[PDB]
Amino acid sequence: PGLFLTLEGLDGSGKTVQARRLAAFLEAQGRPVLLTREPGGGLPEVRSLLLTQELSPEAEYLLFSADRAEHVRKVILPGLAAGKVVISDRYLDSSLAYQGYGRGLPLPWLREVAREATRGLKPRLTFLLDLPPEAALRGLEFFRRVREGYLALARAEPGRFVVLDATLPEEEIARAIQAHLRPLL
Amino acid sequence: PGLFLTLEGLDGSGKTVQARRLAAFLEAQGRPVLLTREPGGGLPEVRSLLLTQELSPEAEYLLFSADRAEHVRKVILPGLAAGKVVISDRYLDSSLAYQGYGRGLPLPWLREVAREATRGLKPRLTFLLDLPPEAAGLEFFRRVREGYLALARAEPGRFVVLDATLPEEEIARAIQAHLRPLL
Ligand SMILES: [Mg+2]
Ligand SMILES: [Mg+2]
Ligand SMILES: [Mg+2]
Ligand SMILES: [Mg+2]
Ligand SMILES: [Mg+2]
Ligand SMILES: [Mg+2]
Numbered sequence: 632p633g634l635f636l637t638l639e640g641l642d643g644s645g646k647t648v649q650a651r652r653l654a655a656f657l658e659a660q661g662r663p664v665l666l667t668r669e670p671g672g673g674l675p676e677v678r679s680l681l682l683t684q685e686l687s688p689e690a691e692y693l694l695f696s697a698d699r700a701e702h703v704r705k706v707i708l709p710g711l712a713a714g715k716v717v718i719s720d721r722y723l724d725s726s727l728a729y730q731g732y733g734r735g736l737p738l739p740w741l742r743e744v745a746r747e748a749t750r751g752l753k754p755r756l757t758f759l760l761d762l763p764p765e766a767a768l769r770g771l772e773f774f775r776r777v778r779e780g781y782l783a784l785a786r787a788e789p790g791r792f793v794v795l796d797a798t799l800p801e802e803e804i805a806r807a808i809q810a811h812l813r814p815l816l
Numbered sequence: 817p818g819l820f821l822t823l824e825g826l827d828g829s830g831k832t833v834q835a836r837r838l839a840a841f842l843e844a845q846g847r848p849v850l851l852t853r854e855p856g857g858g859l860p861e862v863r864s865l866l867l868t869q870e871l872s873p874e875a876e877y878l879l880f881s882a883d884r885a886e887h888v889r890k891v892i893l894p895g896l897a898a899g900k901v902v903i904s905d906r907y908l909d910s911s912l913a914y915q916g917y918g919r920g921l922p923l924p925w926l927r928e929v930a931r932e933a934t935r936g937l938k939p940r941l942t943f944l945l946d947l948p949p950e951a952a953g954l955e956f957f958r959r960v961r962e963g964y965l966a967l968a969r970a971e972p973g974r975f976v977v978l979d980a981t982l983p984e985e986e987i988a989r990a991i992q993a994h995l996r997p998l999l
């Protein structure tokens with residue numbers, strides 16, 4: 632009986648660091664953990680390809696969906712099956728925020744593509760590290776659409792999303808994630 | 817206006833030879849033609865990703881779709897918009913026969929993915945080079961072969977099914993005769 636958790640937000644919102652800290656917290660409790668990430672957790676070559684080329688949004692989404700399809704089947708589901716807590720730095724919500732709200736693809740089609748790609752795997756909890764694009768540690772209108780897109784997703788699924796102020800000190804954010812998670816272990 | 821034609825079949829069916837002979841034939845009639853193909857017509861590098869070992873049928877389809885989405889947008893639709901005859905050696909039916917009939921993916925999901933990927937662009941005619949599957953595992957290739965025949969039965973106006981074991985020049989003459997009314 633595994634537990635699937637995801638972290639979401641702009642690049643530079645603290646995803647990595649908080650994924651790393653949440654893993655250390657679970658290691659400290661003796662709970663087996665698997666840290667992973669998208670894009671590249673399924674097809675690393677999708678990540679590298681897309682560093683240097685820009686494609687239509689449709690094609691970008693489909694490449695990311697291929698990668699996600701492999702990631703789910705070869706990494707996440709097997710980790711869950713072994714009773715691990717599997718933490719993904721980015722998952723489907725990234726595509727919905729970036730390719731959907733950001734680049735304007737229709738959300739119902741994105742979700743229908745995803746339904747087979749993910750085999751319907753949804754995280755139990757998703758932590759959204761929210762901040763404005765100007766506060767991210769690592770064009771402007773686009774990033775605002777993405778940030779507001781994540782907030783919209785979060786509003787629609789208040790039982791799944793936990794929204795944190797990503798401008799808070801690292802350590803504080805980590806303790807809030809822990810408090811949110813304690814009931815589910 | 818533009819005219820969109822595709823060729824389909826198993827590898828070794830002759831569909832590539834016929835697509836090339838068709839392009840030459842239409843260009844020798846002074847017709848503007850654009851010859852393209854999948855995979856790789858949209859995203860040349862897709863061919864690398866498709867060679868990935870142990871690739872899931874879903875991931876394989878999604879990669880072909882990503883190429884296909886780029887191919888439609890950047891090559892095919894602009895070609896048609898300039899009034900070219902655009903001929904693709906393989907198009908969406910290849911995925912339906914290989915990833916659907918061959919690898920078992922559900923057709924309705926394949927189609928729903930395809931609806932944005934392709935922007936609903938359908939060929940006017942599709943020439944299927946029907947090749948017995950042993951001439952191209954074997955159980956997989958039978959499924960793909962029969963799948964193509966099913967796709968053809970389902971859309972008998974679009975598909976022209978040709979016997980791929982006929983001499984090349986007889987096949988080309990048959991393709992030409994199917995085209996003469998639209999040209
Ligand atoms: Mg997520
Ligand atoms: Mg997806
Ligand atoms: Mg910034
Ligand atoms: Mg928005
Ligand atoms: Mg497709
Ligand atoms: Mg076709």
Ligand SMILES: [Mg+2]
Nearest residue numbers: 924925927928
């Ligand atoms: Mg459908």
Ligand SMILES: [Mg+2]
Nearest residue numbers: 967968970971
């Ligand atoms: Mg059909």
